[PDB]
């Protein structure tokens, strides 16, 4: 039909839309911290502690597939990278401080990808 193409040119400008503002996030994070999966060759314990693991390269996966619907499950992934790392590692620790800056810097570019969002449907 004419909407499902309507509607998948939509998701498409969303991906469009959340491909820039994973670029933004992921720049706010140059050490690379969050570039990848937590190894469980490096870290065999990890999966007794979080159970559900996030990183900037498993978001990208699933944002090429269309695979985010809509903004709010996009920051639900943006989220659990940082909500994870302060629970695996402690205050002290680089890592820790890593999540803070980019939960503090992310704020501002998730701040206006809402107000895009809503303002160009």
Do not use: W
Request: glycine share 4%; aromatic share 8%; hydrophobic share 40%.
């Amino acid at each position: 039909s004419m909407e499902q193409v309507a509607m998948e040119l939509r998701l498409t400008e969303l991906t469009r839309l959340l491909r820039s503002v994973l670029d933004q996030l992921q720049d706010k994070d140059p050490a690379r911290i969050f570039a990848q999966p937590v190894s469980l060759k490096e870290v065999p314990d990890y999966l007794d502690h979080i159970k559900h693991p996030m990183d900037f390269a498993t978001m990208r996966k699933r944002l090429e597939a269309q695979g985010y619907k809509n903004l709010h499950e996009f920051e639900e992934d943006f989220d659990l990278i940082i909500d994870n790392c302060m629970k695996y590692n402690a205050r002290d620790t680089v890592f820790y401080r890593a999540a803070v800056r980019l939960r503090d810097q992310g704020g501002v570019v998730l701040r206006q990808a809402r107000r895009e969002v809503d303002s160009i449907g």
